Structures are given as structure tokens and as C-alpha cells.
Design a protein around this nucleic acid. Structure first.
Ligand SMILES: [Zn+2]
Ligand SMILES: [Zn+2]
Ligand SMILES: [Zn+2]
Lengths: 196, 194, 195
DNA sequence: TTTCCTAGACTTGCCCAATTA
DNA sequence: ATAATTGGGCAAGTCTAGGAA
């Protein structure tokens, strides 16, 4: 079938695991993750921290890349991108390309790719060790379009694929989580878990 | 211009074969002998077998192209719907406007005829391997038949054309195709139909 | 011309017109009524016309189409698109915006405008029927609804299809009525019923 | 001559639930 | 448990006949 980006979990030689903040579902939450759903709920354009767990430190030049792909097989060949309303928004942080759904916050070494071959979008940052006195590395992502954006994701489930790659682009590890960009993360999360 | 869906089992005796898929609900690809219709899912493998009576010369290429089955619509270049085209992906070769792609063939070529604009994918004709009887080409349909803005629910014909390095028609065949979710349930049904 | 003749003349080549076969469905964009010898269709769509012949007209031959009002009282007036429709429909670099009738799918179209009669025509080159075919098909588009106030204004038109030579001398001639509308099928179904 | 409707019955993707191995 | 595959069914969306202003 038409090839699509790989999404299988691979801890790699460095024991790469992804972590998240345990925010709860109170009405004030801006980003909340559901361990039972392996799903992150976040608000549009707000901080979403993502934790990198490693058992041994990766080599130097190590990069961390994120990519969104549709969860369903029937839509996997579709490149996740912002709806037209959104790409057209003046919401540029000056670094990200207007069509990318995923941005990286507060990292001037942030890099964006428009795959020449697959048309696929992604954001990379250099991998940093955990801030001394720290257990893991944190990355602040932002999702720039809502799940409900007709014309975009349109209510379809998206996965965020986090890849650990050497300076040459080789795969060192991969992990993933589902994401839902919506107005009320606490409410939505509670509910979807309410279903189980 | 415009292209024919006229069989030309030619001087080589060109014929197409299809696998025996089964009718589960949602089978990936399935062909209906009675209907002469392929029923497949978007982006899934659509195997099409090439059978000749005699090996064609070298330079021979295989071409696929779609057309609307219906009279009026035959003039409308068949292509991907706006949405899918906009959010298209690719494999390093396939252009975003093409509906039909060829899977696993680093030698594939994609054409958008400058004088018809008509789109097509052509691969070299490879004689079957020693001990084989036919040669398979795997195709993928990038939009469902019901893609509003595209297929808009209208029937298409896939026309395979054997041709020489020159571009001369050496052979011709066709099949209709229905890209849908659930090719299984839909073939039964359209059979129940008779 | 001031009002070209619309008389049928198969002439030396056994020139005939053919038409597709669809019923009165709403989903039927274009439809020909043999009884009414009228063709209904809807704005901007495909109108397939079958060019039958008994004798193969020589290379260079041409097929010109022209619309004329049907009523005598309207005959001398040129059929043109309304001013509205005229300020947009110009897609397909060959078709001038005023022309009501266009042909699609032919690199060689040639638009006319009698400089002395102002009548608009779409010319094409005669072409033999497809290898295993018994007729050549032309794809016609009718650029305005017969409704266009300021355009056809509910007035019936006739399309005269002529076979001519490189010089433009007439060879054969047919014609038929066209009703550009809203979901054509019914109109025929009905047009055929008062009958 | 268009424009509304009123539904009903399909068309058709995709949910969910059972079920395989 | 655990993922993949499947079949039941559904409901958003389509076009219908059809009468009406
Ligand atoms: Zn959006
Ligand atoms: Zn599509
Ligand atoms: Zn008009």
C-alpha cells in the first residue's frame, strides 16, 4: 500500500520513553494528558510540555523530531496540516512555516522541514540533557489548529510521533501519543475517560 | 483530446488478470468478474496482472489512466479532489494531482499531457520471471469514488495500455473501478443488484 | 449571412447528427428529445454531438456551429451571452467571452465573428470517426441559460451545424433546438407531455 | 421559468462490538 | 491480555419524486 510514516514504539539503545505532566482535568487546564487513552488534550496555541526520558545520554548532535499523522488507516496518506483559515492567520512566531500544525516553543535552535519527497511536515530541535537536578528533558510544543477545524483535521484523531535521531538522521528511538486540540482540555479528557 | 476504452488484445494477446480476493467486509482489493469491476480502498494495494500470449519487444511500457464511465463526463480529466490534492503526500515521484499511483516501482513515470492535460502513470513492461506466467503491477487509488469535488461519486474506468518506447499502441484493456471503504460489502451488493 | 438558412441538407456526404441516450432525470445534465428535436442541457456542461456521414469528407473540411433565435420576430438579432455572463466566462484561452457556444476538448477550435454580420461561430476541423467508430463526436458547451434576462431572455434558439470546405462553401447542414436550463430532464419530460 | 420546500430511500463512510490468532 | 480483522449497524449526507407557491 502507499507507504506512510512509521509509528511503532522503539525505545532504542538509550531507553527512550516519553513523559508528561500530570495536570488533572480541572477547568483551568491548558494541556492535560490521559494515560489510559495515551492522549494529550490541549488548547490551541498554548504550551504543551513533553518529557524525554532516556536511560543513558544520547550521543552529541542528537535531534528530537515531532510529526503528526492521522491515526486512522483510511487517512494516513493525508498530510496533517493547518486548515486554510489557520495557515492564513497572522500567528507567526517568526520561525514556523504557516502550514505546520506543530511548533516548538522557546527554542531558537528549532528547525522545520517540508519533506521534499513525502510532502510531510515536522519540527526538530537539538536534543538537550536534563537540566541538572532534573530527571528528564522538556520540550514545549504548541498545536496551531483545532481538531474540529473543518477543512483541517476535521474531528479526526491525530498522533504525534516523537523520534530520536542522530545528527545524520538515523533512528535512535521513537514514541507516540494521540492528541486533541480543543477549547476545553479538562472537560474533554474527563468525558473520553468517562467512556473508559 | 479524449481516449478510448476499446480492447486491443493486440498482436501480443494482452489480457488482464485479477486475484481471487474474497468478499469480507472491507477487503482491501476485490475484483468482480461479472461486473468487471475492481473494488478497493484508498491507498491500498490493487494488484493487476499482465498476461500476454507472446512477449512484446523491449521498450514496451505499460500505462494506466482513468476516465469517467459516463458519456458526458468522459471529457472531464479525472483527478484528485481538491482536499486530498491539497493535503497530498507523495513518495518522491507521485504528483499530488494524480489519482492512480504505482506502488513499489522505482521506475515509474508520471504524466500530465500538455495537450489533454490527461494524467497517467507508466511503468516499463517487465516480462514474467522464468517459471512465471504473468507480470504484476501494483496500483493505488488516492481518492474514494465518492470524493466530492473529485470523483464526486461517478464511475471511472482504468484503461491499461501496452505501448512501445515510441508510444505506439500495442495493446489495450480496461476495468471499471470503485474506490470505497468496505470493498467487500459493496461488491456483494452491487452483485445482489445483478 | 442576415439570418442563415436552417434547412436540413445532408448534401454529398450524407451528413447527419447523432445524440446520446439519457432519460428525463434531474441528474441528467444534457438530454436530447427526438420527438421535439430539441436538446436540453444546463449551463456550462457537456453537449456531445454525433457527426455521422455516409461519405468521408476530404481533409480540410470543417464543422461550424452557430446559434440563431427560433422565432422570426427575433431572428435577425445576434445570439450573444448576457452582459453579466460575458464578464467572467473566458476560461479556455480560445473562447472569447461573448460567444454563447464553445466546444471543449479540441486544441484546434477557431472562433469567428462575422465582421459584417456580427454572428458568432465556433469552427472545428472535420475528423473521421474513431478507428472502430461509425461517428465523430464534438463536445459543445452552451455558455448562458436560455433564461439570461439581457441574454436569450426565455427565447428559443437553434444551433446550426454545418459541414463546410476549407473555403467555407457549404457541404451539409443540420440543426436542432437547445434549451439551456435548471435540471433539464423534467423540461423535456414535460415538453413531451403537453404533446 | 426558478425556487422551494416536504419528506423517504438510498449511498456511504466509519463506529463499535465481537472475535480471531 | 493484546492487536488485527470482521460484520452489524448507523447516520450524515445525497439525490428522488412531487407538488406550490
Ligand atoms: Zn484550523
Ligand atoms: Zn479525495
Ligand atoms: Zn447569461
Amino acid at each position: 500500500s502507499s507507504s506512510v510514516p512509521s509509528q511503532k514504539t522503539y525505545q532504542g539503545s538509550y531507553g527512550f520513553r516519553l513523559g508528561f505532566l500530570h495536570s488533572g482535568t480541572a477547568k483551568s487546564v491548558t494541556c492535560t494528558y490521559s494515560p489510559a487513552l495515551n492522549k494529550m488534550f490541549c488548547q490551541l496555541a498554548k504550551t504543551c510540555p513533553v518529557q524525554l526520558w532516556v536511560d543513558s545520554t544520547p550521543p552529541p548532535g542528537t535531534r528530537v523530531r515531532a510529526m503528526a499523522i492521522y491515526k486512522q488507516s483510511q487517512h494516513m496518506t493525508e498530510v496533517v496540516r493547518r486548515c486554510p483559515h489557520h495557515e492564513r492567520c497572522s500567528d507567526s512566531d517568526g520561525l514556523a512555516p504557516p502550514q505546520h500544525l506543530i511548533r516548538v516553543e522557546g527554542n531558537l535552535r528549532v528547525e522545520y522541514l517540508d519533506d521534499r519527497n513525502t510532502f510531510r511536515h515536522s519540527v526538530v530541535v537539538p536534543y538537550e540533557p536534563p537540566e541538572v537536578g532534573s530527571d528528564c528533558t522538556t520540550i514545549h510544543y504548541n498545536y496551531m489548529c483545532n481538531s474540529s477545524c473543518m477543512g483541517g483535521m476535521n474531528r479526526r484523531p491525530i498522533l504525534t510521533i516523537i523520534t530520536l535521531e542522530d545528527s545524520s538522521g538515523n533512528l535512535l528511538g521513537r514514541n507516540s501519543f494521540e492528541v486533541r486540540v480543543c477549547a476545553c482540555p479538562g472537560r474533554d479528557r474527563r468525558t473520553e475517560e468517562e467512556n473508559l
